[model samples]
Target: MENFQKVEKIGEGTYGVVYKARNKLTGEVVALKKIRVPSTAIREISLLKELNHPNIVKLLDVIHTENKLYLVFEFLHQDLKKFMDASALTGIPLPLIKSYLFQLLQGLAFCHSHRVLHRDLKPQNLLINTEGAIKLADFGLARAFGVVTLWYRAPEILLGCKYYSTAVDIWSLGCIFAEMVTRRALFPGDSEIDQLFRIFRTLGTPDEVVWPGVTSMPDYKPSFPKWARQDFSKVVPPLDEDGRSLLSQMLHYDPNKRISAKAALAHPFFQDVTKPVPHLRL
Candidate 1:
């Protein structure tokens, strides 16, 4: 581990601290994720490395010594949330947002194709570098954080369901889409139930008709306050029409019916993006 001299502390989270480090011999710089893992997320880093898509954060190297793990990832020092808020901007630029959204789906699509579920996703877990490369982090490590993150979490899980699928991640991406368009959280819930109330108020209360068998779900309540669905264009003011439809598809109440990440890639939201689109100047 001493081979890479720590440059400085760049970020910290519940599980670990990341440092900007430099290779002692090569002089190459990297983000070194040091965790007293005690372990398991290491398995995810291994599995994710097999997919090795550019949009997925690269595990450049792993030094497993002293029973402590040092994870070396590409030198991305910030996250999507901070990048979006860099200039007092209410929303990211349209073309830049579309490009990042496209890449984000690319990250999800590849994982789902391999039948891997990210389970948790949010602006904080979506890392971006200076070159406009937005990469997905914390794949199976979702358990370390949670699938119940109030904002990006899916409804079926929120509604008390045991079985779920990649659709859950789609729901998260949908929440992220809204955030990108508005530069703020969509649901903004204060508690678990408050979160469901926020969603119902925005997307309408789900019934048997909208979500077949929802009545049989454990948390289903007969007297829950019902709400009419609101328009995405209004809820997320800057979303384009294509973005609106795609967001709805991802956030669908019927988890079985939420668009697959691969199918979502085919949505009009990404259809006409010109070849060779350059990275946005952050």
Candidate 2:
């Protein structure tokens, strides 16, 4: 731990600070996340210890000092949010979006298969390697989804469902997809009520027919029961017909109706994504 040379301060993470560091012996670059643990970093450490996937950011090693716990991770260049913003400004083509979405879904499918719920699935939490491959990062706030994992979360959590599942990730993925396509946040709400209102305004409020047991959810109260649905064209006018179709599937308000990541990989929008596309340097 002492011999590692600090390259630069990466950013202030949720639990601790991260730094771009290099091993003095091997001279290999790595990200060192210094987590100040009280008892132990069990939630994230144990969860990551069990996860071994090509797409999930790998935990290289763990180092412990008197008051600090260092979790070494593979170094990544930037996050998806930065890339999305750049792409929007530069008018990046659709093929690039297809490639990134394919990899994102593949990684998500792997996590879902392993019974891991990346509860915090936002653009900022997805890292891009130098090769342009995407990996899910920041599992500190992630929880086992079978339990109620809502923490200042969206309206789905407000509904007061006793148990949630991997579908929560799918809901967040929908938001990510909308951001990628539209170059703006799909659901940017100040509160849970506002969040649900945003979603309902665009996608329409769910009814008992579409979402059974929705009325009985613990936080379920009367809102606008019958709201007018907005046209997808008005929300995202740039997308082609096929692109709009895919977005509609991913952004399904009903978690049960939302497209699963595995199924999303097979969607017609990504027919060209047979394998991981090599990084196209801009």
Candidate 3:
């Protein structure tokens, strides 16, 4: 803690406040998150210590004091939410969106392979650097058995399905992909019921045929306004046919049907960009 100098206060959330900092010895910029001792903090610390991937925020070190725990992370310029907001007027370019989506899936695939579920995933949780690199962050609410952000949460979780899988994060990735294309939330619901209805209104209400054992869920509601499925192309006008196809698969009603992060990485939308690029001379 004494080796780092605080640059500025970055942001605050349910867990704690984050600050931009620089190492005194090396002058390396980093994010210093001040977290009070809590169960969520413990969970986040444990998970972050075990995970290591390029597209995920790196936990550089942990500082333990008398009453506080400080997590040091590799510094990032901003989050996806701020990036989208800054570009909202002009809209994000298609190539950049595709690249971000590919990286997101790659990170998520690694997490799922390790049997870890990021229950909370949204634009705010995705950190971005100046070089267009995006990494997943903020694991305080991860793997917890409860509601996540309404808009990015999976339909199964919204309907009260407790025993969910990695598909929950896939659904969030779908919401994020749509946002990247449109620069607006795909399902900005005011409440839990409203959130589920918003999803149904766009994708149509689900039944046993579409989502087996859905009715058996503790919070499953039988009385929902029936709606026709919406066209993904029209919803995300900037997206091409392949992009729309991949989005639909990720946002499937059944948790089992949602495209796995690994499969999503292999989708045709990413085929062109997946090739390795050669170094360029200045």
Candidate 4:
């Protein structure tokens, strides 16, 4: 903490308060994430120690002073949600969404390739630098595959499956993709049951055939009273043919059926991506 001059609080993260700070030596602006080292923080730090990617937020340094731990990261101006609001992206065009989603997949692909899972993937976790470059941030709730976020969680974990992987992150990317297009969450549910119903209504209900071992999940049980056939057209009316097609594949009801980040990037969905460029923050 002594090495940095705190500028201002950026926001509250899952396990810490983030701040903008200036390095005393280089006078470089950076994000300082301070959190009490909980049982999970060790796992998070271990994961960060292993990951290095251009699209992922760089973990520049670590500071420990007796009782607290500080994670230093490259400073990003704002996140996708804030950027969308500032840019009035509620009516974003297909071409622009293509650009964002392509970069998002590129980042996730990098993480998946390195065997890392960003469990808390959302618009807020996707940061944008001043140059319009995207970087995945906020790894507080992140873990290897099979982990789940409190809200953007995978159904398999809710049901009881213990062992899952990158497919879970793909589910979140799908949800974030939908939010980017509609400027609202696809499933704003009142509870776990409500959320699952919302997802089922849009993507169809899972069955033994659709999702093998559905009943084997630790907490599996039939809850939704009605499971009508889903209508994707009603769920996302704004997306063009290419966008809708790609979204469907990403948000598959079965994790196994969901497309990998690498495969999704290769789909015709991103042939028009903006040129990949180096982020200035790094």
Candidate 5:
């Protein structure tokens, strides 16, 4: 005898749980983020609803309930991490990499045009479809106005500061760009020591000479090992001259000088983009 059907939840949360469900009729899989009536729920929905774009994951529907709410999103084939890991192992072609990158920058720049800050930029939050189109997921600490500044994140952030800039997200994209080259996180580390260690070793430990006024940063630790900056070409040989230059710009130590997403889309690295850039460039 046929019995009642059931739905399933598939993701973890720091309390905000989400699920994976399929529409049996349409044969489409969808991700459902379950929000238990929190303060930021509206922001999550309102902001995402406002962020309707070609590359950002689409927030399709919402189911309401007194105890909690479920936000539905158009599911895709794989997250950028797993997608790249599998095929990148087979050596992703440069054209494809640039294509994915252009798509990413296009969406990010669009988000910036709206003055919306997407604090998260890791590959896990990036997604891909069967068509090789890239989209961003996981809207973390998204701020709509000038109240926008990253929290206690890393590098410049670890140095103890509140006036964090949009550069934080750029730094994240830098990591992801490097990941695209090596199929791994450029500065993969869990501990603060490991993160800072990798960063200083590769980018060279920032000093007042580079990041002006670094000496006064509250998170500074004098005992840490000092390192000389290495050329981006060495760590990112897979990247061309233009690619490394753009990469270096995104990874700049100074927040103010770092490349904004719009400016990044304008870089010569995307000169050969087959498709017209998805949006405006600075």
Candidate 6:
């Protein structure tokens, strides 16, 4: 901790407090997340150590003291949530949106390829810089089995499916993509039941035909109103035909049929975002 000079408090969350700091010797800026010693912290450390990608938050160093652990990460300018809020008056440009989504999917693809699932992925967890670089952060809630955020959580997980896959993360990505385009939560529910109902009302209630064995799930209920699928064009007006197509695939009711992160990167929606940018070295 003495090696760096704390500039200011950047953020505070369920895990810990994040501070903007500068390396005393190197004079480089960084984010220092001070966390208490716990099982969640240990798991996050293990996962972050193995994750290295351009679009993933870089763990520069780790400092351990008596009862606390400090995770030093490369500092990013802002998060997607803040960025979206700033752009609320003036909408985010289509090119920029495509670029951001491309980088997001690239990061997720890397994680999935390594058999790691980012259980909690939301706009707030996605850090971005002024250079248009975005990175995924905060792995405190990432595990095979756990309670993820209700609104972005996959239907399978909501229905008590213990054995879920990376599709859960994909579902979150879909929600985030929708939010980025619409500047509002795709499904803003007050509770778990309300969340599921909101999703059903938008995409139409899932059944055996769409999601096989949905009724067999532990928390599955038959008391939801049947809703016809809403038009994606109406929901996300900024999206083109290709964008809508990709969004539909990502938001599929069946996890098995949902578009994989790697596959999503190749979608035609990203064709306009082909301009080369220098690789960000953090």
lDDT of each: 0.79, 0.72, 0.81, 0.75, 0.71, 0.82
Q: What is the lDDT of candidate 5?
A: 0.71
Worst 10 residues of 5 by lDDT: 144-153
At residue 29, candidate 6 shows an lDDT of 97
lDDT of 4 by residue, 76-97 (tens): 8878777667646336556666
lDDT at 49 for candidate 3?
72
State the lDDT of candidate 5 residue by residue for 1-282, as single tens digits.
011112565555333565666756565678766655555655666667767889988887656656556677787756766766666556566777788888888888887777666665667678777666889886533442112212224477777776676677788878877777876567866676677788889989888888898878888877878899988778987788999999999888888888988899889999997642222111
- Clash list (residue pairs), candidate 4: 160-217, 160-218
Model 6 ranges off by over 4 Å: 38-44, 144-149, 275-282
**lDDT, candidate 1, 1-282, per-residue tens:** 989889899878445888899999889899888876435666655665566888887777877788877778877767887776773454566777788888888888888888878787878888877666789876655553343358888889888897778899989888988887777788888788999999999999999888999988888889899899987778877677888888888888998888988898898888876433434454
In order, what is each prediction's RMSD in angstroms? Answer: 2.9, 3.8, 3.7, 3.7, 6.1, 3.5
**Which digits, one per residue and each the tens of the lDDT, describe model 2 over residues 1-95?**
78698899987766577899999988899988876553444555656766777778888877767666788888888888777776777654567
With candidate 2 superimposed using the best TM-score fit, by how many Å does residue 262's alpha carbon deviate from the native?
Answer: 1.2
Q: Is candidate 3 or candidate 4 better by lDDT?
A: 3
Model 5: how far residue 61 lies from native, Å = 3.0
Q: Model 4 off-target regions past 4 Å?
A: 37-47, 144-151, 275-282
| Candidate 4 TM-score over all chains jointly | 0.88
TM-score of each: 0.87, 0.85, 0.89, 0.88, 0.84, 0.89
96: Cα error in model 2, Å: 0.7
**Candidate 2 C-alpha error for residue 45, in Å:** 2.0
All candidates in order of lDDT, best leading: 6, 3, 1, 4, 2, 5
